[PDB]
Amino acid sequence: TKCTLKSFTVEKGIYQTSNFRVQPTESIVRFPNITNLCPFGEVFNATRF
Amino acid sequence: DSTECSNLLLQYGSFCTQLNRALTGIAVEQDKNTQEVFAQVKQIYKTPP
Numbered sequence: 001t002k003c004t005l006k007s008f009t010v011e012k013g014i015y016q017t018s019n020f021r022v023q024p025t026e027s028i029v030r031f032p033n034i035t036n037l038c039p040f041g042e043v044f045n046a047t048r049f
Numbered sequence: 050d051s052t053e054c055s056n057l058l059l060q061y062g063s064f065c066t067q068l069n070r071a072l073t074g075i076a077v078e079q080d081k082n083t084q085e086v087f088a089q090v091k092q093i094y095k096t097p098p
């Protein structure tokens with residue numbers, strides 16, 4: 001509150017300050033687990049263009 | 050939920066806090082309007098039976 005009001009004194013009242021959030025508890029990853037390596041050798045190192 | 054955006058929003062200074070102040074002035078004024086309109090009576094009178 002003191003930081004939000006930029007003041008060391010604060011009067012009788014109700015003050016918005018920060019906003020509470022439940023923290024992201026773990027970092028989930030969800031991807032198509034397809035096994036093939038992409039054909040980039042046939043993109044860049046092919047015989048002719 | 051972005052710290053990166055919330056850093057760039059500090060460059061704009063007190064815009065964000067004065068908007069919350071303005072909306073809080075409005076929001077308290079809605080209670081003030083309601084108090085001024087309805088709370089003109091200092092006792093909760095109740096009817097006879």
Ligand SMILES: *[C@@H]1O[C@H](CO)[C@@H](O)[C@H](O)[C@H]1NC(C)=O
Nearest residue numbers: 029030031032033034035036
């Ligand atoms: C992806 O993983 C699940 C188990 O987590 C498995 O059942 C599924 O067959 C896998 N898909 C591929 C494309 O390998």
Ligand SMILES: *[C@@H]1O[C@H](CO)[C@@H](O)[C@H](O)[C@H]1NC(C)=O
Nearest residue numbers: 039040041042043044045046
């Ligand atoms: C293309 O060939 C070179 C060797 O000539 C190799 O180092 C490189 O990794 C290859 N690139 C791809 C995308 O396969």
